[PDB]
Amino acid sequence: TVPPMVNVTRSEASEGNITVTCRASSFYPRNIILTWRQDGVSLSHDTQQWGDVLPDGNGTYQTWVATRICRGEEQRFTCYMEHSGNHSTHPVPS
């Protein structure tokens, strides 16, 4: 186990909407849970976009998950992560 580094970014603001992306990088092994939460409740699969769990080239893995939200409601959305028994929650940066 290598603990994942988590970074949350905002991008592609348009039409009152914005994309929030949660990136988990340089973790091992490949098995990881990554999902957006809304008021603490996990979003379904169909409302999120999923990156593959891919090797770094440094012997670890990385992935990402993104979802499209209304600009202004960022505080209600958090990125949730479970990796080999440990869990964490990260907010959208403000």
């Epitope: 603490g40 409740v41 028994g85």
Partner: antibody, heavy 119, light 108 residues
Amino acid sequence: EVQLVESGGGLVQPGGSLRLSCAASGFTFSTYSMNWVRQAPGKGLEWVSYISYRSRTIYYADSVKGRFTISRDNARNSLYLQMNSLRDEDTAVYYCARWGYGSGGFDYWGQGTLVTVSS
Amino acid sequence: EIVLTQSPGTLSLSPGERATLSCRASQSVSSSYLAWYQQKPGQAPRLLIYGASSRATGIPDRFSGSGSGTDFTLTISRLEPEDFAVYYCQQYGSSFTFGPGTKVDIKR
């Protein structure tokens, strides 16, 4: 003051169907996720179904998936539960419950409505 | 599925004493996703504690919560006769489930 008022329960035949409703007031309804929670007679609480404030995320307990449908009409401050193929184990008081902003929890509950499934 | 168990099943205590209620999760639940509810006999439940330790609106200070991982605690210091109720813990780490509840009776 936040108020949620359920209605529509009653006696129904096994295999029958029944529609529950919940009328909300005192807050901007279209901005809160909503839930149904039930309590069988003398029994514990059992979460039933969840719907997000724009109906994009919906969940059901395994014991009702395929038989119950949750929905909402934000313009009428209303939450619905359509119940089909009812069974005896569906007999309960059904509570309407609001989901708390940011930090979650069932932060307000309706008064409950009783559904009895029997022939 | 995450299953919540609660101990003790029933708790009989005199007014002014301290009630200690336990909740156990079949797997790790983050503290943000653990809540506690109070339900008096003829009533709907009401939210007591959210995020394991935060008091909900209008909840007096004698109600307190703590815990993390798989073990959580609700403390009611200085019991009152009206505190007679069933207390349920609830998680939404994964889906939404309730513990079976602990009945708290008043001794007299």
